[PDB]
A paper describes a structure:
At 2 F(400 µs), new electron density appears near the D1-E329 residue close to W34. This density indicates a new water at this position (W151). The new water near D1-E329 detected in the 2 F(400µs) data after the completion of the Ox insertion at the Mn1 site may also support the O1 channel being the water intake channel from the lumenal side of the membrane. By 400 µs into the S2 to S3 transition (2F(400 µs)), the Cl1-channel environment is rearranged back to one being similar to the S1-state, and no significant changes are observed between the S1 and the fully evolved S3-state (2F(200 ms)). At 400 µs, W150 is not present anymore, and with it the last indication of a fraction of open states. Therefore, the reprotonation of W1 can proceed from the newly inserted Ox. By 400 µs, all the movement around the OEC is complete, and no major changes are observed in the channel regions between 2 F(400 µs) and the S3-state 2 F(200 ms), Fig. 7d.
Light-driven oxidation of water to molecular oxygen is catalyzed by the oxygen-evolving complex (OEC) in Photosystem II (PS II). This multi-electron, multi-proton catalysis requires the transport of two water molecules to and four protons from the OEC. The OEC consists of a heteronuclear Mn4CaO5 cluster, which cycles through five intermediate S-states (S0 to S4) that correspond to the abstraction of four successive electrons from the OEC via a redox-active tyrosine residue (Yz). During one cycle of the catalytic reaction, the OEC consumes two water molecules; one is introduced into the cycle during the S2 → S3 transition and the second during the S3 → S0 transition.
Author numbering:
A (entry chain C): 32 to 473
B (entry chain V): 1 to 137
C (entry chain D): 12 to 352
D (entry chain F): 12 to 45
E (entry chain I): 1 to 36
F (entry chain A): 11 to 344
G (entry chain E): 3 to 84
Write the structure that this text describes.
């Protein structure tokens, strides 16, 4: 009974056509990953940092350790070409199976074959499909471990000497560390799982998730839902979609904050500096400049009475002054050599800042993630000249938007699933209006 | 008003000799300045040391005087502090340091002249806005 | 049945676009106001009135083109094409800003024509004329912003210019110079506009989620017949819902729809009044008690004092380019600036 | 059996004819160089 | 402050537990038409 | 009939004058906490060092404010995004100086309002209604999340979240324009179309239905008494309303399906306000409004100002004055 | 539910419609183009070309500053470009 504008809802109970809708749509994702990567490569100039060039996929490949060497410099673009081509090619096969199943194949599957066929209300069949996909995801997570440990490693921004591709020989398995992240507060200085700052924890957490997903996949193949679950949930295709919509929404918000704060699995070398990073780099820049001119940055009182260059955080740590006081939770490979037990060390500052640190701070201050929609870099009052918007802003904003609409979609489809399941999603029965059989409130 | 040869005529050296850039050179230098320099010197200021700008009068007072094509081309190969007392290739883009500043790698001798020319022409067009900062935006 | 009635007959024939006697006023004036805006934004500069480019021809985009106001030196001239300023010369007329008065004045008679059309069609069809009444609020806003405001000031120059970013500038001018956010008549208009949008959304959603099931399709739109006598949604269930969610609810569908007229219409009427005050610089700019305390006590600070520093910023930084006819020359050293910036 | 020229006909072309003209004028503008 | 922190921890846990268990107590069935 | 099932039966009861529900179980306390703290702070809270520079801003009535200037002031910049509950302060005195109450209020409020949304789903299910009123309310809810949570997260401090007060709101929106050019951002422009259009369509709908009320009363009575709560017949003639509005414009610009009309009424402002909430939420990550500063230049290279350059001049005055003591370095990067 | 004019959908799917309008539509577009490509738009409306906002060594706006001498003021600025 659906209109053309809700036309895909006509697929709910056509398992064979719905399968083609999904596989064709997976062809589109793979196509984009392939075409986008080749577009980025055709446009790539290796002399410029990736983050001046509008690149979001090449940084994901570099981060996996392909095509880069010490300091993030691109050494070989061929792995980029390969990743693009293979994805591009594979979308043709997904395209082929998707259109075949949507147009030509059996409209429904449950007559053609009892294994591929499914009823949404079949809780056993449904948990088995879930179990298969869990196992798949577990394999996926273990492929990242395979790459880090046995096939060349990953890019490590924290490596000695400016960052480098490093093999991960001792992943963290201690569950107090791995699961300790899940229990960290999301507020400032803690940052939940976004605070993961080394590849050992990254790789070990994926060992864990791969095992847990395979464990759980086998569990759901072998069981059916307990009655407490049977009574808490709505068991319908739209209900299942709504559960996934909330999940992806949650995941999108998390990813938004990941690319905005994390400079470990989003190296600043490739993605540009974080907001916090750039703001810290500015204070560093003028600390360096003024001290070279003779200023004693430790003892310089600023207008407010707080230190002009340096001050204390609320728990005592020596931190950069000015408005960047808010960003003192920032940690970065260019800054950490200056940190002592009490925060920034005045003796290291006076004596041990290196040109590469001066360069890096200057670079990151001038590539802060601020810019206009038409890609003029800088604060909104800046004149045209610099064509730049940080990859971090592009990735953060887009995924905030998608996460928001998917929470809307969740609410839409969860409420409709509930109401369709109880039988009043098309409206109120005039002859059996519930409120007319209730007592009035007053 | 237009981009006449008089505004495209700038000092070549300190002896007083002049060179007359072309419109092609001026526009190519503007694009190269944006490519390699504007992230710090948008509008003729210096975001990481605002006490030093690209105003002609400031360049004139640098040691090595830099208000001419030559001084600028030399600055792009071997930058010094404003009094010329120390070389700063390792914290300032230059051909001498194109290993650590890779955008300087693919710049040719003629590109240097074009960048130098744009820097010398632009205050003649924009006046005080060049190197003046936000007061004049 | 003479010529007047025969013409009445023809003006009021049922055709795809109803004309009527109000059509004689409405159609030329609406077409000329609209065509003047499109002509000026495509082709005409503001170089001689404002020192600004303002047309597609000059390099502007949809957000920055405008038909800008005349030069302050024109005062409140009507700027007739045949008047003493342009003296019949079309080109000079455009360069002196004559298309601004052209659009404003034809717009004003256009709005009159539109409201007369609302009266005319309501009388012919046999309905009460509340849509015409409600349209009084758009009219009040237009005449108070586009005519009264500049007539109490020095010239048309300070009316809004007809463009997207030109209007954005007008908003910011009112903050820095009139402190218009602090004005209670604006605050009432803000509550009227935001109040209307809430009412709009909440009523539409409520109807759509209290529908009776009157068809079998999953598209509930088909189950409505415009000639059916029965309500299409349950006021009773809607009332219970909101009584239990919010505490109170509508119970009278006539009051409900009257209230939806009343709220945004009253809001706009209120903001118009405040703008009439700003025509005379009769602002709600300061709280005296605040200023007395702050002058005496340098440790007293509020969001009120903080916002006046921002105003002072806006004034000194925008005035020389926004009022070029005043030849404001502010040396660097006199501009108000906080530390570093 | 319809009329061709109507009050509707006029209102349409009163708008549509200047539109196409202005669109051509604005298209040309994208090729103006300073 | 520790007394307070403790109190609040206990109050929140209590209300969160009420919430989770409330919705696990056959909430789909609490509607006016089809209860199951 | 055991103790627990009776509590469950009262929680979800449709007979309660105010519906509680499982969402209400979280909503009622968090809203009471935020409300009580707000009222007390607005009246009597001492001055707060919002920007971390030991320059406290007086927000409350007893410290020299009126209704218009009063606010509960955002928490200190020194705190940034750190969690600052009462039990983390050495004393209430310290908690009050650093803006502790703001955090307590905005967190309890965002929670309770989120549960308010779900409460709207929940009672719709208990009543046999369709479920999407809560979707309409997610547009305002998302707008409050944007100004109290998302914008602080992206700029790194709750001191840049929106203050809880009239004049503090204006301060927030002036500073926002200077730093993001929100007026030149298309998602804010869609918000204006959403709220201007929603005010329009509110007045239109209200005037069209009021215009076509069926005569049921005398001229001495309010017309409103011609409708009786729960009558089955519609109270106005929609075909007359269509006949008027279709002639005011033309036939096909007028609805004659009341279902599509009211869906349109619901969708226009909801979608417009989703976009403006997404505007704030994405400017939180500094993807700012269009920048056409110096975009037009003449044959020689002179800048030719447009209205956007004039906008920029005003934005500069706001930039250079805001938080006038709180910047030591020449770029205000957050 | 109609007032007697021919339905739009019937007109625009008609061969005669498209025989006429495949000429009129591109001709008007071309007309509008020529209005700009020839320069006429500048002279008609009085809009500065990119080389005639300022005189060569001039950075002052030619602002009208007189109400009844405005016409002549503009003309005086324009002659200062020759
Ligand atoms: C079931 C239903 C849900 C019930 C949950 C109820 C409680 C939820 C609490 C959520 C609110 C948390 C706010 C996050 C605050 C903030 O600081 O959030 C950011 C944190 C990250 O924290 C930052 O994490 C950083 C991690 O980086 C550190 O480590 C890095 C390592 O590379 C770098 O070195 C970096 O320099 C260094 O600082 C630092 O710790 C910062 O100090 C710290 O601020 O993100 C996070 O925890 C990641 C996820 C946060 C997502 C929150 C988004 C809010 C979405 C609201 C959507 C509303 C939509 C509208 C509804 C209608
Ligand atoms: C409601 C429904 C709305 C539907 C209405 C439809 C729209 C109709 C269009 C109306 C056209 C309005 C024309 C107004 C022109 C105007 O005012 O033009 C202004 C002139 C006065 O001219 C001004 O006069 C000023 C003062 O001059 C005097 O003072 C100077 C100072 O020394 C010198 O001495 C000078 O010689 C001397 O004349 C300056 O010279 C200004 O530059 C000059 O423009 O008045 C005159 O035309 C007329 C003045 C008397 C008429 C008063 C009626 C005006 C209506 C607006 C009233 C609102 C009042 C606003 C107050 C808030
Ligand atoms: C995994 C994601 C997913 C999936 C599979 C579905 C699946 C479904 N949805 Mg749900 N939905 C989702 C996410 C999802 N939705 C999200 C995120 C939202 C919030 C916005 C919604 C909101 C929503 C509503 C409001 C409704 C559905 C409906 C439906 C059903 C019919 C859909 C249809 O035919 O659309 C047909 C497709 C179109 C009409 C095209 C839409 C065009 C979009 C809006 C424009 C997007 C363009 C983008 C912005 C880029 C612009 C660039 C330009 C060049 C185009 C179907 C079961 C309907 C329903 O309840 O059925 C039961 C229904 O009424 N959905
Ligand atoms: C979803 C994730 C995502 C993200 C973060 C980006 C981000 C970026 N892209 Mg990619 N892109 C994407 C998806 C994405 N794109 C898709 C799906 C396509 C296929 C159409 C492309 C095709 C594409 C091309 C062809 C190019 C980019 C380029 C760019 C850069 C400039 C963007 C710009 O100016 O936009 C301008 C802003 C807009 C267009 C705003 C759109 C707003 C929409 C309509 C609202 C959404 C409503 C709902 C969904 C930036 C790094 C450019 C670049 O630098 O390449 C190196 C470039 O040339 N992108
Ligand atoms: C990713 C997007 C997507 C996908 C995969 C689908 C998929 C599908 N839709 Mg939905 N739909 C979508 C978006 C999508 N839709 C949108 C945006 C709208 C709003 C306009 C709708 C509205 C809609 C309606 C109203 C209906 C569907 C229906 C269907 C199904 C049958 C369609 C059919 O018979 O085609 C027939 C069409 C053709 C034969 C035309 C040719 C189409 C081909 C496949 C184009 C692709 C060419 C491509 C380049 C091939 C490459 C070749 C290579 C792989 C070898 C199919 C599974 C129908 C359904 O549910 O059936 C019960 C149905 O009634 N859809
Ligand atoms: C998850 C997606 C999916 C699912 C569930 C199905 C399910 C089905 N398909 Mg479709 N199909 C798909 C994708 C999918 N197919 C794709 C991508 C293509 C394009 C190549 C096709 C092309 C296709 C055709 C042409 C036909 C089917 C048919 C069938 C049915 C019988 C399959 C069978 O017995 O093979 C059993 C399994 C095998 C014979 C071999 C499986 C070994 C595979 C190839 C290796 C594993 C791949 C790996 C896990 C992932 C890819 C690797 C990559 C990451 C590099 C069944 C309903 C038949 C049908 O419906 O006829 C009525 C039929 O004729 N399918
Ligand atoms: C995509 C992943 C996925 C999905 C959809 C499901 C789905 C399901 N599982 Mg399976 N499961 C999975 C992965 C998945 N599982 C994996 C990987 C494992 C191995 C660890 C399991 C192990 C497992 C067991 C052991 C059982 C299920 C059961 C169930 C059913 C009830 C779920 C339920 O009530 O959750 C709703 C969640 C709760 C009621 C508890 C809430 C507690 C959470 C953690 C609170 C945290 C909230 C917070 C905001 C999140 C932040 C992070 C947090 C750690 C702090 C349902 C069909 C049950 C069943 O019927 O089995 C047949 C069951 O007993 N699952
Ligand atoms: C320098 C000053 C310049 C400005 C001068 C302003 C004056 C211009 C006034 C323009 C008036 C426009 C009326 C158009 C008349 C028309 O073409 O239709 C009349 C023809 C016949 O149309 C008929 O159409 C009729 C329907 S209807 O009237 O068009 O609605 C139908 O009844 C009939 O059969 C059919 O033949
Ligand atoms: C169902 C349907 C639908 C959908 C569809 C789909 C979604 C599809 C897809 C499909 C797909 C998804 C496709 C794909 C394709 C692809 C391909 C076909 C590829 C190819 C490739 C190539 C050829 C390559 C080449 C190369 C190389 C190799 C190297 C380098 C160079 C180059 C690149 C050239 C629609 C909506 C329409 C409608 C309804 C129905
Ligand atoms: C990889 C990695 C890692 C790790 C991680 C992990 C280990 C994670 C996990 C995670 C997890 C472990 C998660 C969990 C989650 C859960 C959730 C998400 C939940 C949900 C829930 C819900 C949703 C419910 C609901 C309900 C209720 C409450 C009541 C009744 C009804 C219902 C059922 C509906 C780390 C960080 C180290 C690092 C990096 C990498
Ligand atoms: C002023 C004047 C006059 C008049 C004139 C006229 C009346 C004009 C008209 C004109 C016109 C009448 C014009 C038109 C134009 C138009 C246009 C220019 C359009 C455009 C549009 C567009 C561009 C659109 C597009 C789009 C988009 C964008 C999105 C969506 C889709 C669419 C398609 C909508 C006269 C002679 C008396 C003389 C005096 C002066
Ligand atoms: Cl401020
Ligand atoms: Cl600072
Ligand atoms: Fe209504």
């Amino acid at each position: 009974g659906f209109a053309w504008w809700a036309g895909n809802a006509r697929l709910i109970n056509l398992s064979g056509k719905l399968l083609g809708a999904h596989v064709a749509h997976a062809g589109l994702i793979v196509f984009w990953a392939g075409a986008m990567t080749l577009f980025e490569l055709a446009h790539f100039i290796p002399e410029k940092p990736m983050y001046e060039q509008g690149l979001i996929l090449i940084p994901h490949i570099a981060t996996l350790g392909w095509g880069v060497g010490p300091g993030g410099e691109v050494v070989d673009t061929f792995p980029f070409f390969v990743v693009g081509v293979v994805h591009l090619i594979s979308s043709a096969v997904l395209g082929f199976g998707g259109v075949y199943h949507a147009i030509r194949g059996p409209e429904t599957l449950e007559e053609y074959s009892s294994f591929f066929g499914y009823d949404w209300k079949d809780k056993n069949k449904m948990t088995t499909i879930l179990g298969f996909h869990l196992i798949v995801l577990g394999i996926g997570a273990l492929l990242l471990v395979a790459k880090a440990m046995f096939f060349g490693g990953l890019y490590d921004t924290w490596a000695p000497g400016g960052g480098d591709v490093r093999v991960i020989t001792n992943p963290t398995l201690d569950p107090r560390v791995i699961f300790g992240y899940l229990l960290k507060s999301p507020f400032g200085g803690e940052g939940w799982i976004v605070s993961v700052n080394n590849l050992e924890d990254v790789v070990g957490g994926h060992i864990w998730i791969g095992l847990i997903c395979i464990a759980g996949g086998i569990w759901h193949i072998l069981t059916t839902p307990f009655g407490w679950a049977r009574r808490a949930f709505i068991w319908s295709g739209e209900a299942y979609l709504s559960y996934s919509l909330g999940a992806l929404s949650m995941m999108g918000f998390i990813a938004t904050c990941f690319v905005w704060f994390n400079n470990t699995v989003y190296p600043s070398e490739f993605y540009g500096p974080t907001g916090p990073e750039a703001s810290q780099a500015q204070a560093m820049t003028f600390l360096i400049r003024d001290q070279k001119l003779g200023a004693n940055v430790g003892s310089a009182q600023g207008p407010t009475g707080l230190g002009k260059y340096l001050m204390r955080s609320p728990t005592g740590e020596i931190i950069f002054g000015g408005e960047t006081m808010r960003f003192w939770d920032f940690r970065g490979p260019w800054l950490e050599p200056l940190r002592g037990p009490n925060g920034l060390d005045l003796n290291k500052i006076k004596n041990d800042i290196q040109p590469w640190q001066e360069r890096r701070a200057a670079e990151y201050m001038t590539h802060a993630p601020l810019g206009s929609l038409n890609s003029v870099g800088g604060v909104a009052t800046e004149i045209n000249s610099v064509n730049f918007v940080s990859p971090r802003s592009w990735l953060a904003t887009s995924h905030f938007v998608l996460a928001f609409f998917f929470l809307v979609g969740h609410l839409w489809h969860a409420g409709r699933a509930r109401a369709a399941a109880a039988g009043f999603e098309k409206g109120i029965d005039r002859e059996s209006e519930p409120v007319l059989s209730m007592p009035s409130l007053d | 008003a237009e981009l006449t040869p008089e505004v495209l005529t700038v000092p070549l050296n300190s002896e007083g000799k002049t060179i007359t850039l072309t419109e092609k050179q001026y526009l190519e230098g503007k694009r190269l300045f944006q490519y390699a320099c504007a992230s710090c010197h948008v509008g003729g200021i210096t975001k990481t040391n605002p006490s030093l700008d690209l105003r002609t009068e400031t360049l004139a007072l640098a040691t090595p005087p830099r208000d001419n094509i030559e001084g600028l081309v030399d600055y792009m190969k071997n930058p010094t502090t404003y009094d010329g007392e120390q070389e700063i290739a390792e914290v300032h883009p230059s051909l001498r340091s194109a290993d650590i500043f890779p955008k300087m790698r693919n710049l040719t001798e003629k590109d240097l002249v074009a960048i130098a020319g744009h820097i010398l022409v632009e205050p003649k067009i924009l006046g005080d806005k060049w190197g003046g900062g936000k007061v004049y935006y | 049945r003479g010529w007047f009635d025969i013409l009445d007959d023809w003006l009021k024939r049922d055709r795809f676009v109803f004309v009527g006697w109000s059509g004689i006023l409405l159609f030329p004036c609406a077409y000329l106001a609209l065509g003047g805006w499109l002509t000026g934004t495509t082709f005409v500069t503001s170089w001689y009135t404002h020192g600004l480019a303002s047309s597609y021809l000059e390099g502007c985009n949809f957000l920055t083109v405008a038909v800008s106001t005349p030069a302050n030196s024109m005062g409140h001239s009507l700027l007739l094409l045949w008047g003493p300023e342009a003296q019949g010369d079309f080109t000079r007329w455009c360069q002196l800003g004559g298309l601004w008065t052209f659009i404003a004045l034809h717009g004003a008679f256009g709005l009159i024509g539109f409201m007369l059309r609302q009266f005319e069609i309501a009388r012919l069809v046999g309905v009460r004329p509340y849509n015409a009444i409600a349209f009084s609020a758009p009219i009040a806003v237009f005449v108070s912003v586009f005519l009264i405001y500049p007539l109490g000031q020095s010239s048309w120059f300070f009316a809004p210019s007809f463009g997207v970013a030109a209007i954005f500038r007008f908003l910011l001018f009112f903050q820095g110079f009139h402190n218009w956010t602090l004005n209670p008549f604006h605050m009432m208009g803000v509550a009227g506009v935001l109040g209307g949008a809430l009412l709009c959304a909440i009523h539409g959603a409520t109807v759509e989620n209290t529908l009776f099931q009157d068809g079998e399709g999953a598209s509930t739109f088909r189950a409505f017949n415009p000639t059916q006598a029965e309500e299409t949604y349950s006021m009773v269930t809607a009332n219970r819902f909101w009584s239990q969610i919010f505490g109170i609810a509508f119970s009278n569908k006539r009051w409900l729809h009257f209230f939806m007229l009343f709220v945004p219409v009253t809001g706009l009427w209120m903001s118009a009044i405040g703008v009439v005050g700003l025509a005379l610089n009769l602002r709600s700019y300061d709280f005296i008690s605040q200023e007395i305390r702050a002058a005496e006590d340098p440790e007293f600070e509020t969001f009120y004092t903080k916002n006046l520093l921002l105003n002072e910023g806006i004034r000194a930084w925008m005035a020389p380019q926004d009022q070029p006819h005043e030849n404001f020359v502010f040396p660097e050293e006199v501009l108000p600036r906080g530390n570093a910036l | 059996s319809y009329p061709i020229f109507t009050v509707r006909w006029v209102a349409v072309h009163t708008l549509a004819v200047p539109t196409i003209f202005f669109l051509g004028a604005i298209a040309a503008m994208q090729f103006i160089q300073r | 402050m520790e007394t307070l922190k403790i109190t609040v921890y206990i109050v929140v846990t209590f209300f969160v537990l009420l919430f989770v268990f409330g919705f696990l107590s056959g909430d789909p069935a609490r509607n006016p038409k089809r209860k199951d | 009939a055991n103790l627990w099932e009776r509590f469950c039966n009262w929680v979800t009861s449709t007979d309660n004058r105010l519906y509680v529900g499982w969402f209400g179980v979280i909503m009622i306390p968090t809203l009471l906490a935020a409300t009580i703290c707000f009222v007390i702070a607005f009246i009597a809270a001492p001055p707060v060092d919002i920007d971390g520079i030991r320059e406290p801003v007086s927000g409350s009535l007893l410290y020299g404010n009126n209704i218009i200037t009063g606010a509960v002031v955002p928490s200190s910049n020194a705190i940034g995004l750190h969690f600052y509950p009462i039990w983390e302060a050495a004393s209430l005195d310290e908690w009050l100086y650093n803006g502790g109450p703001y955090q307590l209020i905005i967190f309890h409020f965002l929670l309770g309002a989120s549960c308010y949304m779900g409460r709207q789903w929940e009672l719709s299910y208990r009543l046999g209604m369709r479920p999407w009123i809560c979707v309409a309310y997610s547009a305002p809810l998302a707008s409050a999340f944007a100004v109290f949570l998302i914008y602080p997260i992206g700029q790194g401090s709750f001191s840049d979240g929106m203050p809880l007060g009239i004049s503090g709101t204006f301060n927030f929106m002036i500073v926002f324009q200077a730093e993001h050019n929100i007026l030149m951002h298309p998602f804010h422009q869609l918000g204006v179309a959403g709220v201007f259009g929603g005010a329009l369509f509110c007045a239109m709908h209200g005037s069209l239905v009021t215009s076509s009320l069926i005569r049921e009363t005398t001229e001495t009575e309010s017309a409103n008494y011609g409708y009786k709560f729960g009558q089955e017949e519609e109270t106005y003639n929609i075909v007359a309303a269509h006949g008027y509005f279709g002639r005011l414009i033309f036939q096909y610009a007028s609805f004659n399906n009341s279902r599509s009309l009211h869906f349109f009424l619901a969708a226009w402002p909801v979608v417009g306000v989703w976009f403006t909430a997404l505007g704030i939420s994405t400017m939180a990550f500094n993807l700012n409004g269009f920048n056409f500063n110096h975009s037009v230049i003449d044959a020689k290279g002179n800048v030719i100002n447009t209205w956007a350059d004039i906008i920029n001049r005003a934005n500069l005055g706001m930039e250079v004055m805001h938080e006038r003591n709180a910047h030591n370095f020449p770029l205000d990067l957050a | 539910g109609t007032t007697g004019e021919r339905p739009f959908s019937d007109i625009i799917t008609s061969v005669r419609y498209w025989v006429i309008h495949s000429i009129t539509i591109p001709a008007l577009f071309i007309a509008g183009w020529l209005f700009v490509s020839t320069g006429l738009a500048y002279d008609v409306f009085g809009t500065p070309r990119p080389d005639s906002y300022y005189a060569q060594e001039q950075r002052s706006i030619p602002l009208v500053t007189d109400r009844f001498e405005a016409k002549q003021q503009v003309e005086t600025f324009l002659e200062q470009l020759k």
